[PDB]
């Protein structure tokens, strides 16, 4: 009878894991300082531990429940969001990352409720929205700082995608809530180390100028909408536009099933390495409403610096196509076209939002 393979007992992520049969998933308590259940997959056939490490996505710090309790006691959403921003400044575990994003979603719904109750009210609504937005922009900045990225990697691939997608979704939704509570003309720009957000509400009457984002920022990415596009999308004489860019988020938006077109062989830079990667920041433009899927006669144009030029090729202009229901997605090239590309930069034109 040929041998069975087993993983060795190992301490990984400060959890002691038992000797385990190949193929088995094992559960153990989350590490000291957190609550929840951790798991670790012993790979089938190999009898080696999953090289990505244990799944700590269920492991949370005490502050997560504290914030959840503030929500129950009916505290103001903007104020709670501010506490969340503070908590994410420090050490955070994988479970804290996804909980933070879920908490921002919950807070957005609470905020929207408070806003409908104020349907001096107008300036109050605006102040409250801006307070919320500043808090979530800070929270996102905290979650994407380089020292927080290892915590994201303590979630499995699917949880990383789900969390990143929820993050993209909640920030955009929050931005459009702000757009509903400012008076034209308005421009609100918030620039941080790992995220920049702009909300602008403009009249389409008379002279309209193209929009270029960001401003006040030495950017690795920029995006623009033509004056005609703005005119063509007028609603009651106004347009509401949301722009966002993110640093490091692309790490988590998996290229599995990406619909890219390769003109050559894709390899890797190491054993078990990736052959297709997001090689730019993620940069977003939306008009009037989230997920409009509107066709643009004048395409949106964006230019990005490559994160690493060396040993990469075959730039493909893409957008994140995701389901609001499942919060999962994939990169699609549909309706996007490469305008120019060299070793260090690519310019793209996409015919839709």
């Amino acid at each position: 009878v040929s041998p069975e393979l087993f993983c060795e007992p190992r301490e990984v992520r400060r959890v002691q894991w038992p000797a385990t049969q190949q193929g088995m998933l094992v559960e153990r308590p989350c590490p000291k300082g957190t609550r929840g259940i951790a798991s670790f997959q012993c790979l089938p056939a190999l009898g080696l531990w999953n090289p990505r490490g244990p799944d700590l996505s269920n492991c949370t710090s005490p502050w997560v429940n504290q914030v959840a309790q503030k929500i129950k006691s009916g505290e103001n959403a903007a104020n709670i969001a501010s506490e969340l921003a503070r908590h994410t400044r420090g050490s955070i575990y994988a479970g804290d990352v996804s909980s933070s994003v879920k908490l921002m979603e919950q807070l957005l719904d609470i905020l929207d409720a408070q806003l409908q109750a104020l349907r001096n009210k107008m300036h109050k609504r605006e102040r409250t929205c801006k307070d919320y937005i500043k808090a979530v922009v800070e929270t996102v900045d905290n979650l994407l700082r380089p020292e927080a990225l290892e915590s994201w990697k303590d979630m499995n691939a699917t949880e990383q995608v789900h969390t990143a997608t929820m993050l993209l979704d909640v920030l955009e939704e929050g931005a459009f809530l702000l757009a509903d509570n400012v008076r034209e003309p308005a421009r609100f720009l918030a620039a941080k180390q790992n995220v920049v957000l702009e909300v602008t509400v403009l009249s389409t009457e008379g002279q309209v100028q193209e929009l270029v984002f960001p401003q006040e920022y030495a950017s690795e990415s920029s995006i623009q909408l033509s004056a005609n596009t703005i005119k063509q999308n007028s609603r009651n004489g106004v347009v509401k536009v949301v722009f966002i860019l993110y640093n490091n988020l692309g790490l988590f938006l998996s290229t599995e099933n990406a619909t890219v077109k390769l003109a050559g062989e894709a390899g890797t830079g190491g054993p078990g390495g990736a052959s297709l990667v997001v090689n730019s920041q993620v940069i977003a433009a939306s008009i009037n409403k989230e997920s409009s899927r509107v066709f643009l006669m004048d395409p949106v144009i964006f230019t990005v610096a490559h994160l690493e030029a060396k040993n990469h090729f075959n730039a493909n202009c893409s957008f994140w196509n995701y389901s609001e229901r499942s919060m999962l997605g994939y990169w699609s090239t549909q309706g996007c076209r490469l305008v120019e590309s060299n070793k260090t930069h690519t310019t793209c034109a996409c015919s839709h939002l």
Binding site: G264, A284, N314, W320
Partner: peptide, 15 residues
Amino acid sequence: TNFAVLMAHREIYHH
């Protein structure tokens, strides 16, 4: 809508 540029890692090296 959220946009980015994907790239492949090289496989083949000559000369």
